[PDB]
Symmetry: C2
Subunit: 139 residues, 2 copies
């Protein structure tokens, strides 16, 4: 089977700007860096920033709903939202779904999200107000 | 402090096709499904397939290097590769490294990867044969 996510690779246009953002702003730990990439960790997750000649800034109106969500502790959600806003981050969605969620772009427009709450919590919420046609696989 | 990846959401064009691919072919466990999405897991990873009116198939040469790598056991790599090849999966890249990596597309073109090996293993391989400009953070 697929055991887990091995690593997330994001195409970037300016490695220096991207490392600053992911390592200093978002606080990921930096393990290695070379001319055209960087390896970082977020918890267990291996995140690779990869220089790609073809990458440009992609505004949120062009890119679709594909996005990457990172877990924050409940008491950390507010101060981290605040830190991101003050850094002038672009908000791509207002929150309306289950749990504190905060939606912001990376320096190349990768759609990011801060989120408090597991899948278990989302499933719990969906048991009470199901989405249209919802079917839970545990039958 | 972001604590971990919370979930990966992929925009899809055809939820039925995508669920079949992710759940049946790739074998992720399905937890829930509704009219415009599904929730699956891959180990500790929450994966959400989300129907998006704006999503079409994106040819691998039209999208950049952004990709999602998934861990497989070493004994699982070859047989999983061939099972994917036999299913008519598209290969978007030749593995030119010395590690085990298989590059393939989901039904909408999301770039995925089977990979054997940890960050620690890549690093150790990089110490032996470093990339240009390589800096290793272990050096205070």
């Amino acid at each position: 089977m697929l055991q887990s996510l091995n690593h997330l690779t994001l195409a970037v246009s300016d490695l220096q700007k991207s490392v600053t953002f992911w390592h200093e702003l978002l606080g990921l730990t930096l393990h290695a860096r070379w001319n055209t990439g960087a390896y970082l960790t977020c918890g267990d997750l291996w995140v690779c920033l990869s220089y790609d000649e073809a990458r440009q800034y992609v505004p949120p109106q062009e890119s679709d709903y594909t996005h990457y969500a990172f877990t924050v502790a409940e008491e950390d959600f507010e101060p981290l939202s605040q830190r991101l806003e003050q850094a002038g981050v672009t908000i791509w969605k207002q929150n309306k779904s289950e749990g504190a969620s905060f939606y912001f772009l990376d320096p190349d427009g990768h759609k990011l999200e801060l989120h408090v709450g597991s899948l278990a919590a989302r499933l719990a919420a969906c048991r009470e107000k199901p989405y249209a046609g919802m079917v839970f696989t545990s039958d």
